[PDB]
C-alpha cells in the first residue's frame, strides 16, 4: 500500500553509522546522530509529498562538589578531564578562590557575586575561561 | 556579597573551548560541552558549600522536503552531509524510490509500507541503512 500519511516514530535503526560514514559525516556528528530519536511526519496530496523529519537527542549531567572553605579536599573532575586534584578554597575579599593542585599547572577557579550576576573564572595553564551566570 | 545561595543560569561563556583544550579534553567532547546549558545550584551555610552544576545538551534538527513524484528537485541535505543533489522520486511498485544524483555514487533511498510499519532504506555506495517506524 502506497498510503504513507501520518506521524511515524523510528523503532529500529540498522547500520546508520556505516551509511553516515559513506556520506563522510564527521565522527562527532555521527556519535550524536545514531543516538537521536527520529520522527517523520508525512503529508501526501496526490503526487505531492511533504516529509518533515525531526531528529532529537537530550543529554544531562550533574556535577556535585561539597566543601568547606579552608578544608582541602580531593576532587575528581568527572565533568571535565577526569583528573584527581587537591582543591583548596579560600576567600579573597568577597571572591571565592580555589587552587586545584595536580598534574596541570596554574589550575583553579574564582567565583564571586555582583547583584544578580555570578562570575566564574576557570584557569588552566595559559587559558582563562570566563563565565557569567544570572540569578533564576 | 558573600552569600552565593540560589540557582544561577549561565548567560555568557568565553573561551570555554581553550580552557578545555588545556585540560586535554578531546575535540568533540569540547564541541558538545560548549553547546551545553549550565545551571549552578548553590546551597551555602557560612563557609560550607554544596555546589551542583547541571549541564544539559539538547540536539535538535528538523529536515523538511517538498517534492512531486516524477519531478526532479534540488535537495540540500542539511540534516546529514550538507550536499546539493538532484533528487528524483518515483514509484516502483508500491515502493517510493528516490535517486539523489550528485558527488556520491549510488546515493538514494526507498520508502514503503509493510503491514503497520513504514520502512526506509538509505543507500550510499555499498552502505545500506534500514530504519523501521511505527505509526503514532
Resolution to 1 decimal place, in Å: 2.4
Q: How many CB atoms lie within 10 A of CB B82?
A: 10
Which run of H or E residues covers position B18? helix B16-22
List phi, psi (to 5°) of B72. Answer: -55, 145
Residues A123, B14: contact at Cβ < 8 Å? no
Chain B: give the shortest CA distance to residue A86, in Å. 16
- A95 - beta bridge partners? A92
CA A89 – CA A96 distance, rounded (Å): 7
What is the grid cell recorded at A121?
573564572
Residue corresponding to grid cell 516524477: B70
Q: Helix, strand, or coil here: B116? A: coil
Q: Of A78, A75, A68, give the one whose Cα is nearest residue B50.
A: A68
The answer to whether residue A82 neighbours chain B at the CB level (below 8 Å) is: no
User: For residue B48, which residues of chain A lie inside 8 Å, CB to CB?
Assistant: 67-69
Q: Helix, strand, or coil here: B43? A: strand
Residues B93, B111: contact at Cβ < 8 Å? no
Tell me chain B's radius of gyration from C-alpha atoms: 24
What is the grid cell recorded at B88?
528524483
Q: How many CB atoms lie within 10 A of CB A60?
A: 12
A44, A99, B13, B86, B127 from A24: Cα distances, Å: 32, 43, 31, 19, 12
Nearest to B130 among A7, A14, A126 (CB): A14
Burial level of B76, CB count in 10 A (0-12/13-18/19+)? Answer: exposed
What is the grid cell recorded at A115?
547583584
Number of helical (H) and strand (E) elements in chain B, helices listed first: 2, 9
Residues B122, A19: contact at Cβ < 8 Å? yes
Name the DSSP class of B132: E
CATH number of A6-56: 2.40.128.20
User: Is the Cα dihedral B13, B15, B21, B23 positive or negative?
Assistant: negative
Residue corresponding to grid cell 546539493: B84
CA A40 – CA A54 distance, rounded (Å): 6
Distance of CA B66 to the CA centre of its chain: 21
Burial level of A54, CB count in 10 A (0-12/13-18/19+)? Answer: middle
Residues A86, A72: contact at Cβ < 8 Å? yes
3-state secondary structure chain A: CCCCCEEEEEEEEECHHHHHHHCCCCHHHHHHHCCCEEEEEEEEECCEEEEEEEEEEEEEEEEEEEEECCCCEEEECCCCCCCEEEEEEEEECCEEEEEEECCCCCCEEEEEEECCEEEEEEEECCEEEEEEEEEC
CA A21 – CA A24 distance, rounded (Å): 5
CA B119 – CA B132 distance, rounded (Å): 5
Distance of CA B61 to the CA centre of its chain: 5
Chain A: give the shortest CA distance to residue B94, in Å. 5
Q: Of A118, A38, B72, give the one whose Cα is nearest residue A109.
A: A118
Residue in A closest to B41 by C-alpha: A64
Q: Report CA dihedral (B84, B89, B92, B93) to the nearest 10 degrees.
A: 140
CATH number of A73-134: 2.40.128.20
Q: Of A52, A20, A37, A54, give the one whose Cα is nearest residue B81.
A: A20
> Which of B:37-76 have CB within 8 Å of A?
38-40, 47-70
> Residues for chain A: how many in total?
136
Residue in A closest to B33 by C-alpha: A80
CA B38 – CA B13 distance, rounded (Å): 10
CB spacing of A94 vs B65 below 8 angstroms: no
User: For residue B18, which residues of chain A lie inside 8 Å, CB to CB?
Assistant: 127, 129
Residues B111, B119: contact at Cβ < 8 Å? yes
> Which of B:4-23 have CB within 8 Å of A?
4, 6-16, 18-23
Sequence spans of domains, chain A = 6-56, 73-134
Which run of H or E residues covers position B34? helix B29-34
Amino acid at each position: 500500500t502506497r498510503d504513507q500519511n501520518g506521524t511515524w516514530e523510528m523503532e529500529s535503526n540498522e547500520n546508520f553509522e556505516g551509511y553516515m560514514k559513506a556520506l563522510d559525516i564527521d565522527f562527532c556528528t555521527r556519535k550524536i546522530a545514531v543516538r537521536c530519536t527520529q520522527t517523520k511526519v508525512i503529508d501526501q496530496d496526490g503526487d505531492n509529498f511533504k516529509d518533515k523529519t525531526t531528529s532529537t537527542f537530550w543529554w544531562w549531567r550533574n556535577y556535585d562538589v561539597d566543601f568547606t572553605v579552608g578544608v582541602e579536599f580531593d576532587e575528581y573532575t568527572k565533568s571535565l578531564d577526569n583528573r584527581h586534584v587537591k582543591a583548596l578554597v579560600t576567600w579573597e575579599g568577597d571572591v571565592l578562590v580555589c587552587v586545584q593542585k595536580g598534574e596541570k599547572e596554574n589550575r583553579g577557579w574564582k567565583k564571586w557575586i555582583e547583584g544578580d550576576k555570578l562570575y566564574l573564572e576557570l584557569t588552566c595553564g595559559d587559558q582563562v575561561c570566563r563565565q557569567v551566570f544570572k540569578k533564576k
